[PDB]
Amino acid sequence: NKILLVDDDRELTSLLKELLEMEGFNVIVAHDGEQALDLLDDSIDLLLLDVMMPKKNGIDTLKALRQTHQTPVIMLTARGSELDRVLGLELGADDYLPKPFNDRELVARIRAILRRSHWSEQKLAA
């Protein structure tokens, strides 16, 4: 499974890339919304997307990517109010996990959405 990490915090993306690779995932990193849209293609199984970023924020990235891709999206951001969470989900995100986050919960939420993608793939092939 291929994950596209989108966050301007280079310290967080390096830490998360290492954590997720250790959990068996293939991770590619984007540091803004424009780079994310450049790297988003059919090979991506899931996006981890931040909100507050320079050039193009996560909400605008989500709106743009949803015009062409149905790729699973988990918002992963310091914008964790109940409002922020509802907004993200309604704009097209599958899940919303505020920062600070628990490593194990992040990995389990990634695995839960990719398990649903696998169920859909099995059904589609049949």
Using CB under 5 A as the binding criterion, the count of chain residues that bind Mg ion stands at 3
The token pair at 9 is 């915090």
Site for Mg ion in 27-56 (CB under 5 A): 50, 52
Round to whole Å and give the CA distance between 46 and 103: 17
Site for Mg ion in 75-94 (CB under 5 A): 78
Choices 25-33, 41-49, 70-78, 80-88; region in contact with Mg ion by CB under 5 A: 70-78
Least CB distance from residue 78 to Mg ion, whole Å? 5
The residue sitting closest to Mg ion, measured at its beta carbon, is 52
Site for Mg ion in 99-118 (CB under 5 A): none
Round to whole Å and give the CA distance between 85 and 87: 5
Cis bond before residue 100 (omega within 30° of 0): yes
Nearer to Mg ion, 52 or 112 (CB): 52
Are 61 and 49 in contact by the 8 Å Cβ rule? The answer is yes
Nearer to Mg ion, 45 or 50 (CB): 50
DSSP 19-34: HHHHTT-EEEEESSHH
Residues forming the site for Mg ion (CB under 5 A): 50, 52, 78
